[PDB]
Design a protein around this ligand. Structure first.
Ligand code: A1A99
Ligand code: CL
Length: 167
C-alpha cells in the first residue's frame, strides 16, 4: 500500500492520472520522481522547467555541478540526483527529443531506467515538447516498465484520450 490516490489502473503495475507532476510530488513526496531531462540537465521548459522552478533553482545548481564533473548523459540514459523539496530522489531520464531528430527507438531504453526503482512518480517520456506521440510513449511504458509506475498527465484532454485509446 502506498499514498498515491485517484489513479486509473492500466495494468498490474502501470497507473495513470490527470495531474500536475509538480503538485503531485509535493503532496506525495515519493521516493522517486522522474524528470523529463536532457543530456545537459538544462531544465529550461516542459516538465523539467516546472520541477526545477518548484525547487527554487536548486535542481539546476545541483545539475550543473553533476555535468561539470561527469559530462552529459546519453540519450536513453539517466542519473539519480536529489529530489530536493519534491521527493527523496529525482531520476533524471533522457528520452529522445523528436524535435532534435533523435531516434524514437531509444524510448524503450529510456523507460528501462525505471526498472531500477521499485516505485516511481513519472511523466510520459518524450511527450510534450520532446515531440513524440504520447499514445506511443504509453505503449512503450506499459511494455517496458515492470516496477510500479504512477504516470502523471498534465493535459486533461490528452489524459482522456490516453485512457480511451488504451489497449
Ligand atoms: C502532458 C503530459 C506531459 C507531456 C508528460 O507527462 N507533461 C507533463 N506531465 C505532467 N506534469 C507536467 N508538468 C509540466 C508538464 C507536465
Ligand atoms: Cl512538456
Amino acid at each position: 500500500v502506498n499514498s498515491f490516490s485517484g489513479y486509473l489502473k492500466l495494468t498490474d503495475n502501470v497507473y495513470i492520472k490527470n495531474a500536475d507532476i509538480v503538485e503531485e510530488a509535493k503532496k506525495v513526496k515519493p521516493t522517486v520522481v522522474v524528470n523529463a531531462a536532457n543530456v545537459y540537465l538544462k531544465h529550461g521548459g516542459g516538465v523539467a522547467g516546472a520541477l526545477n522552478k518548484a525547487t527554487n533553482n536548486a535542481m539546476q545548481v545541483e545539475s550543473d555541478d553533476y555535468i561539470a564533473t561527469n559530462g552529459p548523459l546519453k540519450v536513453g540514459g539517466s542519473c539519480v540526483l536529489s529530489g530536493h523539496n519534491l521527493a527523496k530522489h529525482c531520476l533524471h531520464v533522457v528520452g529522445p527529443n523528436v524535435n532534435k531528430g533523435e531516434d524514437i527507438q531509444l524510448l524503450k531504453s529510456a523507460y528501462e531506467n525505471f526498472n531500477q526503482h521499485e516505485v516511481l512518480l513519472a511523466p510520459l517520456l518524450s511527450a510534450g515538447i520532446f515531440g513524440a506521440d504520447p499514445i506511443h510513449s504509453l505503449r512503450v511504458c506499459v511494455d517496458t516498465v515492470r516496477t510500479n509506475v504512477y504516470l502523471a498527465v498534465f493535459d486533461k484532454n490528452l489524459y482522456d484520450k490516453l485512457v480511451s485509446s488504451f489497449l
